[PDB]
Amino acid sequence: NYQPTPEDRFTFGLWTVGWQGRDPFGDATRRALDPVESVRRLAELGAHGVTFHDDDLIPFGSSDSEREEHVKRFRQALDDTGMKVPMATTNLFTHPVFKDGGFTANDRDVRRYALRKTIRNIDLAVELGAETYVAWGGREGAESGGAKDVRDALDRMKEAFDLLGEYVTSQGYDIRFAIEPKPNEPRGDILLPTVGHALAFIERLERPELYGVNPEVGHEQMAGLNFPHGIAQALWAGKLFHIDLNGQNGIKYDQDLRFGAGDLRAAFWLVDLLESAGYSGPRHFDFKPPRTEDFDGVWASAAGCMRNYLILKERAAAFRADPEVQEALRASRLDELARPTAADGLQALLDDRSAFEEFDVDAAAARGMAFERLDQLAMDHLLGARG
Amino acid sequence: NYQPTPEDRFTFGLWTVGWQGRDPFGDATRRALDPVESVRRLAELGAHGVTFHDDDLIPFGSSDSEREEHVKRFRQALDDTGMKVPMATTNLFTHPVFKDGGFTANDRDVRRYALRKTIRNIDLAVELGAETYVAWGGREGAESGGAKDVRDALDRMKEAFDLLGEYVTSQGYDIRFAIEPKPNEPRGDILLPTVGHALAFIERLERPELYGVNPEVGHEQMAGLNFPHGIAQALWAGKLFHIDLNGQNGIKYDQDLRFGAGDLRAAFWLVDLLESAGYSGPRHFDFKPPRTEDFDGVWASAAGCMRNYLILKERAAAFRADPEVQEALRASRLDELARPTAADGLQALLDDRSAFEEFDVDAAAARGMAFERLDQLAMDHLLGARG
Amino acid sequence: NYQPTPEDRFTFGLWTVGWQGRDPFGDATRRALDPVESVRRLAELGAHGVTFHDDDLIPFGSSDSEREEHVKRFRQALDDTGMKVPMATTNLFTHPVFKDGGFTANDRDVRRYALRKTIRNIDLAVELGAETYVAWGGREGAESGGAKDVRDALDRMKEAFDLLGEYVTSQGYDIRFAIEPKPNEPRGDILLPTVGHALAFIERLERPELYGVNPEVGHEQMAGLNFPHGIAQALWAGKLFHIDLNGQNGIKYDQDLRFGAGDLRAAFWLVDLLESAGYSGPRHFDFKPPRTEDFDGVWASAAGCMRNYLILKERAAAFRADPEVQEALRASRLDELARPTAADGLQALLDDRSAFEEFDVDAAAARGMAFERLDQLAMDHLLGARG
Amino acid sequence: NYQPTPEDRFTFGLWTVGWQGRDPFGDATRRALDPVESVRRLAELGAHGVTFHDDDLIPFGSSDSEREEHVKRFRQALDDTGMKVPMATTNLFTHPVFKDGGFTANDRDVRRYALRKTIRNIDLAVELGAETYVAWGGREGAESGGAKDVRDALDRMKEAFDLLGEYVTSQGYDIRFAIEPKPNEPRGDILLPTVGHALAFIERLERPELYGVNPEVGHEQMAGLNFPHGIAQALWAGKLFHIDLNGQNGIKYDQDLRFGAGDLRAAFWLVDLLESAGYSGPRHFDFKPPRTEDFDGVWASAAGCMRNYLILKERAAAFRADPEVQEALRASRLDELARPTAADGLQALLDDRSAFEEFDVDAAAARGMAFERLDQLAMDHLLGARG
């Protein structure tokens, strides 16, 4: 039951199942995974593809020769399995040189290095067939107010993304960029902290059509925000290029639990939205198997990611297909929300006495919205207490 | 010491000092204030002007005749005192008819009523000299996932703001709009929950140049965000039309404490930013004197708002003027952050071996940022432990 | 399906279904309910009983004669229906006289009034058959640091509860007290803000055996705490006298959603714990039907409270009864957690070389905990994707 | 100005200035410090003493011979400088064997190992003169609901602490235990998550007089709680054995900023409380110099910890000594809060018609508390805008 297949478009970062379990207070609990073994094990589980940071695949500081041998091994595993590489990204956060950022480091020579490191991996990603290149500015930010002039930092961030856009267009690459927001951790505050801030920033770039967002469930929830609402605004703007699925229990450190864990009802409304809006991009899991687990637990946790998506998809489809739910949606006037407020125009609205002078405000106020009955039907469907 | 005068541009909402103290669990503790008395008392304290919701000035449901008598009394108090009215707004949240929203209510007849109520007060605001018209969509949102299709709701929100822009341009009014974000309360989640989401939404309106943001200190802090950082992004985008100053102690209900209370160091960095960027709009206080206070406490709390701004302005100016702080800023390379990363261009950057092939990553990584010394100089200046 | 009956011990406050919908930013959306009608409607829904504040039943300031007529009407409705009154409480938060608290008001005459108001309602509660008397100190606290000496306030709080204990013991009443914690709202910070703080305070009272806690789901979640964990500590201490069930979406204002809404997985683990520990007290719902709803929505929301408890009870029972889950619990060594660490004693432990000198730390470290497989079985059971 | 000396009782953990800067997303940015160099550098800065985990001083897995050489080097540095060791603790969180906890690991052999590792370091701590032994149960907890039966885990936690108490009493040691709470990180939820929960747990131990709390500023603030209020309850109970001073910006990952950073006004009210209550224990800094800093920044950050305490102490003393503040405290009736509510007794209170029957509730309700004027005097004193 609920068996994933490649058509479900489930993808995983190499750094997810490969997380060794080292956290701020503890050493690694698992040995390092060979990327070739991860490709083969994920293929057997029914995954569609994998993603990577440059430093996940090529150990930092590798010579041009060692680099080639790592890529060839990886490519052969992809060719044997038919696994895809739909997305790639750069590690601009682990090495100590990035301790004050990559694109917005105060030191200019670090900013130039960060751009050259990124451009090198764009070339590789395009070769492997990636359609989306993700940027997570995890070190862009500050712990103290005087350390970063944020207006200058946004100038430097815009400069960097404009140069990347000039690079891909000059090379004729068919790849787009997605900014992944996070409000904090590892910096005290991170620049572009939410989906909203990232969407607003994109509109000031020279070629906005090349950039979208890669929202992550847990990151918006670290600010206490409604993740389905934020995804809806991204879809409304035409900017949902990619998505990171996982779980998070409220406002605390970034947990990266398996998808379905954390806020389960938010996961249900998210899947309802993605499916009903026809999102066609990868369903990418950015999660960490807890460091309590051995390698059997790693693959159990990865399998649970896909299983929970498929269960929620079934329940959301049954919710929307139920005639009693359709009746409830009409009782709550969800259909009237789709009607234009004033397609008759401004002047007609101003001359309409039923819109103000003769509007019966008390009769309208007395109408119940019937939202609680609708939400209990949604709860019944999620829990399988009806079909 | 620290005496406010009208040139300091301090303004107050009628609903602030006039808050009667009724909260979700308690009845009012103060009698209602006559708006004329508030104008005169605020003028004596050194305020520059006042702001209002329509329903603060004209009791809801007033006839056209009673409406005129309320406005004339108010105008005469303004004329006697020289007090200005730089901003006005609509109450689309108190009356039960708005229980599911104004512009994004599911019921279409409510949405049309909300627009007509708003347009009526724009006319009045322009007559009184307001330059900014604020919209706080406090009822736009939901408690449950099925109650609101957020994509349709954003269509309805865009429709409403586009119609308001068509109205002001057809009337030839010199007034601009500012959206005030809030993440939650009184709805479970509110649409456009942060400065970022509001900035992104503005870019999809038909005439974006007419719209900016009115961020409030406490509202961004209800999402755990850095308020100075968010203000910096608004300034970077050219969209800081107005601002609401108050205090908030972390992630909880909207406290609306007097400015300076709450996160004191964030208040310092905010004033540093506003003054150094040359913000020239009103310094508006959206605060509630706690319901523990009598009327003497109301005016003490209002006076403290202005006093704390003036103290922080002095400390921030002394911080920036100190040669030792200027030296510390250079030691932390704040000046290098202002330099373009690659004004030599993409091709020069790609051919620069010092940017990658011969970049000494370990030497760069070993440089300390000296951020802690800089921040302790900032602390010393805030506390007056140096000048 | 999932029909509640009186044996399920579901109870409701008069103030829950009777909430008129007035919130900090809006007027009431529903008319006031007659307490007699609430008793009859709740009886028809299958509820076991009702609870009340004094001021819910007797309008504040009622003469001794009017008081009697309100009580007689209420008693007759209870007698007609067989409905029970298992708990009562005092309103020490609505009237402006309590704006700085009841038991810990700075003014001594207010503290004496608060005790006399409480004692009067204890007499009534005992007459009606209440077994638990709840105290929620919603106004005990402060917005600013200098307003309240917290050590003196705790002296005054201990004094008040000791006097109440002396009163009930001198009257020979068979009633116990339960303190209901809340971290904030309506005060900036409330004294005894969590279950832990309340449990610790009880141990300093003169007769600790008379006092326990009444934890509320949403209140502990307003501090980001794990509500099942806190309930477990209360059960471990023998102090879970009563419980308030509802829902809350994270760290924000007190939402009081219907039970099952909010954190659904926390609701599942809560019901699992209550049932497996054999909690025998009332399942009391302290919730507010959203002000979007008319009276049909009020009773739908109340019915959903009980329905969701009954569904979760079924799923938790099926989880614990599943042989595959029992196997998983053994694989994760939940049974070894029940074994004493050192029943052989301190000296035996010190002389045991297998406990340190010859302990194979690397072999033990390599054991996986198999927690993810167990949690996915729990998810499958919650969602009805197995039985 | 504000020069620390040993009489100020400032202490530092070896792990604080010695933090190498490795965080969940990045490698170390600083080389390891020799504990002997830390002792000498801290002595030169004016510190009173140092603290340590066992594994800070003796590398894990050291032979009995290597162990002796590490201790002798350390002791000689203490003897040369006169530096004290007032507190020690155990590392039960870094090694992978503790991935599910120490005292509450599901595996019984791990729990026995954790006790033997702790007991070994108690012996060493007593030899070096420690008066307090701290326990931070950082791995005691869970990421998922089924992984930990919390009632059994509390049984195991009580068993462990009872055995430690039996050990110290059988050895005749003059050392007490302090539990350090934290709500989360690195586990999803940690057992005993706040000061309140820890105080309540202590009361169920066999010898409660041996145990107190070691609260940390940032940890209580990770739950959004008022740290001065929690310290006040700990002092009221007689249980403040030790304290961890640092800074934290709201609800997020554990930042461990230098003291004074984070919530500056909470730091002021904390110092006011500690000094006015006559706390005589160490002022211990548990902080991490940000990984942006080199070694000069490490010692600047450590110096700032002590400087900020000394500045706040001066401002709080001036606040309390100001006759205008004393007048304000009387106007807010802080002195009436110290008066017993009913020293005349229960029967006198019941027969007092002025306490209820003839209490003028409206006159009492009309009294303002004058809290805002008092708080602005506190703000003026903190900022040095009066003396």
Ligand SMILES: OC[C@H]1O[C@H](O)[C@H](O)[C@@H](O)[C@@H]1O
């Ligand atoms: O940007 C790709 C990934 O980089 C880092 O691993 C982040 O922790 C993760 O959130 C992000 O998705």
Ligand SMILES: OC[C@H]1O[C@H](O)[C@H](O)[C@@H](O)[C@@H]1O
């Ligand atoms: O929009 C004007 C004002 O309206 C309401 O009173 C809001 O509570 C306040 O935040 C806002 O500034």
Ligand SMILES: OC[C@H]1O[C@H](O)[C@H](O)[C@@H](O)[C@@H]1O
């Ligand atoms: O104490 C009884 C009740 O009093 C108030 O209505 C509180 O809001 C509620 O939480 C509590 O349960």
Ligand SMILES: OC[C@H]1O[C@H](O)[C@H](O)[C@@H](O)[C@@H]1O
């Ligand atoms: O218990 C001693 C110390 O141990 C760990 O380093 C904790 O992170 C710190 O909070 C605690 O004070």
Ligand SMILES: [Mg+2]
């Ligand atoms: Mg994450």
Ligand SMILES: [Mg+2]
């Ligand atoms: Mg991610």
Ligand SMILES: [Mg+2]
């Ligand atoms: Mg506000």
Ligand SMILES: [Mg+2]
């Ligand atoms: Mg505002």
Ligand SMILES: [Mg+2]
């Ligand atoms: Mg509540």
Ligand SMILES: [Mg+2]
């Ligand atoms: Mg309650």
Ligand SMILES: [Mg+2]
């Ligand atoms: Mg800490």
Ligand SMILES: [Mg+2]
């Ligand atoms: Mg600590």
